[PDB]
């Protein structure tokens, strides 16, 4: 469902949402989440601090 926080104003679906990943291939109503990185271990704002002092 649309339990999550919604940033647009009136364009909300107000209807059946779903995640379209594994319910089927290509069938369910669309609301797909996109990760930055599939498995997250360390943020790369730390690696950019890691080399920039050495640099």
């Amino acid at each position: 469902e649309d339990i999550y926080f919604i940033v647009p104003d009136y364009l909300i679906p107000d209807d059946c949402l779903q995640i379209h990943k594994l319910y089927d291939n290509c069938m369910s109503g669309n609301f797909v989440v996109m990760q930055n990185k599939p498995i997250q271990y360390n943020s790369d704002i730390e690696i950019i601090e890691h080399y920039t002092d050495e640099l």
């Binding site: 059946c16 779903q18 319910y23 089927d24 290509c26 069938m27 369910s28 109503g29």
Partner: peptide, 24 residues
């Protein structure tokens, strides 16, 4: 062809509403 897609969309709509009140 077009129906094949809408028929697929409505079956998922039935399935994701049946599970909201299912015994499953």
């Amino acid at each position: 062809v077009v129906l094949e897609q809408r028929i697929a969309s409505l079956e998922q709509q039935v399935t994701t509403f049946l599970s909201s009140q299912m015994q499953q």
